[PDB]
A paper describes a structure:
The hook is a relatively short axial segment working as a universal joint connecting the basal body and the filament for smooth transmission of motor torque to the filament oriented off-axis of the motor. The model of FlgE consists of three domains, D0, D1, and D2, arranged from the inner core to the outer surface of the hook, just as previously modeled.
Based on this cryoEM map, we built atomic models of FlgE for 26 subunits that cover more than two turns of the 1-start helix of its helical assembly. Accordingly, the subunit conformation gradually changes along the circumference from one protofilament to the next due to the supercoiled nature of the native hook structure, although the conformations of subunits are nearly identical within each protofilament. So, although the conformations of the 26 subunits we built into the map were all similar to one another, we identified 11 distinct conformations among them, one for each protofilament. When the two subunit conformations in the shortest and longest protofilaments are compared by superposing the D0 domains, domain D1 shifts up by 5 Å and tilts by 4°, and domain D2 tilts by 24° in addition, in order to achieve an overall subunit length extension of 14.7 Å. The D2 domains form a six-stranded helical array on the surface of the hook by their tight interactions along the 6-start helical direction regardless of the protofilament length.
Author numbering:
A (entry chain K): 303 to 402
B (entry chain P): 52 to 302
C (entry chain K): 1 to 151
D (entry chain V): 152 to 302
E (entry chain F): 1 to 101
F (entry chain F), G (entry chain L): 353 to 402
H (entry chain E): 1 to 51
The structure:
């Protein structure tokens, strides 16, 4: 303040869960707790299972698009192999029908 | 006649996944699981989550079964029957210090402390001050100061004082005495069943203090090289690991 | 006959959808990666019956942390979650730290959902940690002067 | 049930006697939401005060009943040994209030396996209660054991 | 399947033209930069929907005040704004003091 | 604030960061192009299987 | 709203969104071509009985 | 297959970002250099399967 004394205006509550994986992500960067997520236990930064925080630094995304780019082609090639096993299923049924 | 559809059990390529709870073997073993029906099944998938009850399940919620962690220290039991293992937020309770040991290296060139009788407020009454932080039956901190006073050739009075106890008196009667051989090796007096102070409704710790592996230096400083104990604070939980040979440990 | 491969096509289509989401959600702050989980069908028949998606999960490692000079960009690096509330009073959880002020000077994200904090009451205030979260209002309230007691 | 770890180094609170509105009159406030036969939510605030070493005056208040009397008697007393094991007063019956013409809810509150923490704060570990709101329908599932369920 | 990736495309295009703005807007006096901020869309499905702009928010830290020999060149080095009215009486707020008479 | 009269405020951009942020925007644009072209050719082989 | 002086109003079409819409439109065109293809050959296996 | 490649691809990514950290923290006082030590993957097959 202008008299150069500071007063605490609150503390940012962090929250953890039983599992992180049960979190049903809503329509934003938001997640939401569920029955599958476990009810959230609440606290502050640095107490037990909780998160050491930072001030001005912002958390980037965790995607590594090298692994994403190498996973899209393996999903792509086994997609095409699934297309070819229904293709040869079509061919064996085609020669199954018209054999007379 | 189709003779039957056989599996092949060579291990697939193990793939480095940066997730923590993703343990997968590469041999002929089999993970053991159970569902809520009560029937035991066997798998090899590495996707291991934990429920809202925090027991380790697969992706289909089938609980992993493992050997339990029974005792204090928690170990295996002599019935040998696996069970659904959990990762609780139940806090690690503290237990009183029972074995604490302090190793000391004291110079033999040190003169006898001048200002006699002993005082904890007089640095010239002892030769060496040391600190060991023990924990009692409930488990709060006790900064046991131990005190080393050269009486004569190769003989060292050893005094104990709980600085954490405001209701305790100063040590004036002898706790123990390190008596060394000619060679500088400890002969006797290297153990004491010493009792701490009583603080805030927590009863005192009564622990075996040991001075084994201590040796009398010839020229140097009075030096504590190694303190160890089995007392601690209530830790709630921080993290956990699946160790490399199968067991799960909790930080 | 056909069921195995149409299940495989659906599995690879969901897989491509998840990783295309993950590529699209690169460099959005607080996004956590998508991952598919597959499992195979069986029956009394000894042959196999395809693959089902056992479920879509997230990857809960930490992202890298980019130091921005903006002070209202608080991020965390461990298991925690910011506890947000919306305009409907529903509790949500997030890790995107891009925090605005609104008109009323309580901390919203860049969507408008208010944070929650343990409030600070008194003079001088302390952490009133009664496990009761409330939206962090950070007002222009004047510092009420107090008396000297110990000079 | 409310299982909670209690700080053994909490002092006896400076505000004496007890107050329901004044924060420094108790060591820790906790909240459990209970439900009656009508279905309304009652926010039972549990108030922990320490009397002397190793036992705690536990007072209860029905903050969702605005016409309720402030407690000046002991709802129970948590007694601890030297090892932090709960001794007695760990399970107590309690009646709630009524509002909007509802019936009074009476339940057994359980503090089993509550430990007395040496150093820390008072933190609620796990609460569970069997009361619940009315619910119309969201989903309905055919489980593999021939059991149909609604959620 | 496809809409996620075209959402990523126009999100990166929004990045690219606000950054091309700020690069084109570099070394003018009293401009404060823009910043694109994003968020993922979701639905009842656990699989995704892409990315939208959460918004174009500006950074309000101060630019480095440069010495200039002209005397009508004021500039706040803190968190104030100027105030401007026009021929239509509407209030406007600035940050540079290119103040001709 | 606290006003100065001679000194006039420059821009807010640090164009090293903008010139390195346009590259990241370019490359995740190109990876989004990669996933639309791969959904194109999986749908291409989803048609032409007969 | 606020009319401007010399700036023109450029087009509404973001051509990436149309370049993926033509992809999905042409591939379900091709899927419709495959269902008239299978209707063709089930009709000639209905004809060529005798 | 793709597994040796992704393992490999990542190894180079983490090595690149560690030595980029070493270039970025050049002449920051008291900083210590970082090297990414790697190790190869094997399993029950005789052929190697990554890093």
């Amino acid at each position: 303040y202008s008299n150069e004394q500071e007063q605490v205006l609150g503390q940012i509550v962090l929250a953890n869960f039983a599992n992180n994986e049960g979190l049903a992500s809503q329509g934003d960067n938001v997640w939401a707790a569920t029955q599958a997520s476990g009810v959230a236990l609440l606290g502050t930064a640095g107490s037990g299972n909780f998160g050491k925080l930072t001030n001005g630094a912002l958390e980037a995304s965790n995607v590594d698009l090298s692994k994403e780019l190498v996973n899209m082609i393996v999903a792509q090639r086994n997609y095409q192999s699934n297309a070819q096993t229904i293709k040869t299923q079509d061919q064996i049924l085609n020669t199954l029908v018209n054999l007379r | 006649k189709v003779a039957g559809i056989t599996q092949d059990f060579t291990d697939g390529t193990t793939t480095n996944t940066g997730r923590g709870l993703d343990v997968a073997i590469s041999q002929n073993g089999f993970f053991r699981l159970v569902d809520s029906n009560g029937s035991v099944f066997y798998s090899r998938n590495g996707q291991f989550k934990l429920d809202e009850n925090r027991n380790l399940v697969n992706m289909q919620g089938m609980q992993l079964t493992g050997y339990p962690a029974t005792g204090t220290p928690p170990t295996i039991q002599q019935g040998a029957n696996p069970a659904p293992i959990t990762i609780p937020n139940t806090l690690m309770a503290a237990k009183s210090t029972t074995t604490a040991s302090m190793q000391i290296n004291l110079n033999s060139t040190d003169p006898v402390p001048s200002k006699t009788p002993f005082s904890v407020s007089d640095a010239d009454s002892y030769n060496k001050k040391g600190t060991v932080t023990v924990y009692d039956s409930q488990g709060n901190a006790h900064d046991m100061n131990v005190y080393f006073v050269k009486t004569k050739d190769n003989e060292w009075a050893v005094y104990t004082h709980d600085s954490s106890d405001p209701a305790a008196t100063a040590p004036t009667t002898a706790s123990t005495t390190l008596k060394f051989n000619e060679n500088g090796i400890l002969e006797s007096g290297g153990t004491v069943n010493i009792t701490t102070g009583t603080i805030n409704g927590a009863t005192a710790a009564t622990f075996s203090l040991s001075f084994l592996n201590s040796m009398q230096q010839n020229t140097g400083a009075n030096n504590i090289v190694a303190t160890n104990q089995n007392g601690y604070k209530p830790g709630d939980l921080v993290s956990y690991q699946i160790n490399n040979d199968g067991t799960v440990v909790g930080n | 006959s056909f069921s195995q491969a149409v299940s495989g096509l659906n599995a690879a289509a969901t897989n491509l959808d998840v990783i295309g989401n993950n590529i699209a959600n690169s460099a959005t702050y607080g996004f956590k990666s998508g991952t598919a989980s597959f499992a195979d069908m069986f029956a009394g028949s000894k042959v196999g019956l395809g693959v089902k998606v056992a479920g879509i999960t997230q990857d809960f490692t930490d992202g890298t942390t980019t130091n921005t000079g903006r002070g209202l960009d608080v991020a965390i690096s461990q298991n925690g979650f910011f506890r947000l509330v919306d305009s409907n009073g529903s509790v949500f959880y997030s890790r995107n730290g891009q925090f605005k002020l609104d008109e009323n000077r309580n901390l919203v994200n860049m969507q408008g959902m208010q944070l929650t904090g343990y409030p600070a009451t008194g003079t001088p205030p302390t952490i009133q940690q009664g496990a009761n979260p409330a939206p962090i209002t950070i007002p222009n309230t004047l510092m009420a002067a107090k008396s000297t007691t110990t000079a």
